[PDB]
Write a protein that binds this ligand. Structure first.
Ligand SMILES: [Cu+]
Length: 97
């Protein structure tokens, strides 16, 4: 089902929430900015099927509200991270079963 990726916790902690995310081939994964911005989508790498090193948008959306959404299909576990909040420990995952 349609899911969303929140960047930042109510604990002023810059982390991807939910830390883990699962979906099916054909589902969508939204992305909104919680706090401790800015943020952005900087995937780590995905298995054959998709293009992790492509979807990565360096369009640091300063304006808080809701970055954008994107649909997937390629089955497997996708990994990403926050370009800025890289050391802060802001990484997550996305499954497309
Ligand atoms: Cu972040």
């Amino acid at each position: 089902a349609s899911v969303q990726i929140k960047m930042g916790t109510d604990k002023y902690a810059p982390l991807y929430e939910p830390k883990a995310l699962s979906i099916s081939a054909g589902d969508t994964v939204e992305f909104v900015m919680n706090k401790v911005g800015p943020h952005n989508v900087i995937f780590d790498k995905v298995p054959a099927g998709e293009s992790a090193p492509a979807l990565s948008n360096t369009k640091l959306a300063i304006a808080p509200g809701s970055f954008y959404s994107v649909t997937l299909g390629t089955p497997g576990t996708y990994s990403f991270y926050c370009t800025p909040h890289r050391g802060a420990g802001m990484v997550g995952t996305i499954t497309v079963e």
